[PDB]
């Protein structure tokens, strides 16, 4: 795998 | 019926996607995909207790978002406090028959959502500009792949450290792992995390070497849980 998103 | 559609359906002149951790262009709709179309992918949070996600919409064929065109930004807020990798955020790219893009982000816990609407390429870019972007992308493919792989290795190492720490701190593994082994794991994880924080521009082989170092400590311990 699940790709990551920043805030 | 299905081959006559090949000539009737318009296409997406450029890949469309969003920025993922490390500044990576993650495409949800590939260049030359037929439109109208809808593509969905599920993402998660980068940091612990992250209250929201920033959806940064990019267009272009290059590996990093800084080398592509920014189309817009919106935030999806209200994410419940949870460890990195726990929240699930459904992101959908929708292009209608007029080339209009709607990007939606939805929290899977509540169905809470936000979105942005972006006009078609024809009213933002010239055919010249588009072809130029594609050309530049083809010209620098190897370099771009190097960058992508670099970020991938970084994210893999960081995720592995967090997941190991989480694993040995889980109440489910209490008594399955000795306190000593737990200490070994946690110490090595902290060392790796410090290394990561101090080496933001490290290269693929460095990240890999570090991950292998961590694995040398962790693998026999986790493997021991599953012995015959």
Residue numbers in the entry:
A (entry chain C): 1 to 7
B (entry chain A): 386 to 613
Cite, word for word, the article reporting this structure:
The stress inducible human protein HSP70 (also called HSPA1A/A1B, HSP70-1 and HSP72) is of particular interest because it is considered a cancer-critical survival protein. HSP70 binds to small hydrophobic stretches of amino acids in nascent or partially folded substrates; together with the actions of critical co-chaperones, it directs the substrates to a particular fate, such as re-folding or degradation. HSP70 proteins share a similar overall structure, comprised of an N-terminal nucleotide binding domain (NBD) that, on its own, exhibits modest ATPase activity, and a C-terminal peptide substrate-binding domain (SBD). The SBD is composed of a two-layered β-sandwich (SBDβ), which contains the peptide binding pocket, and an α-helical subdomain (SBDα) that functions as a lid, covering the substrate binding cleft.
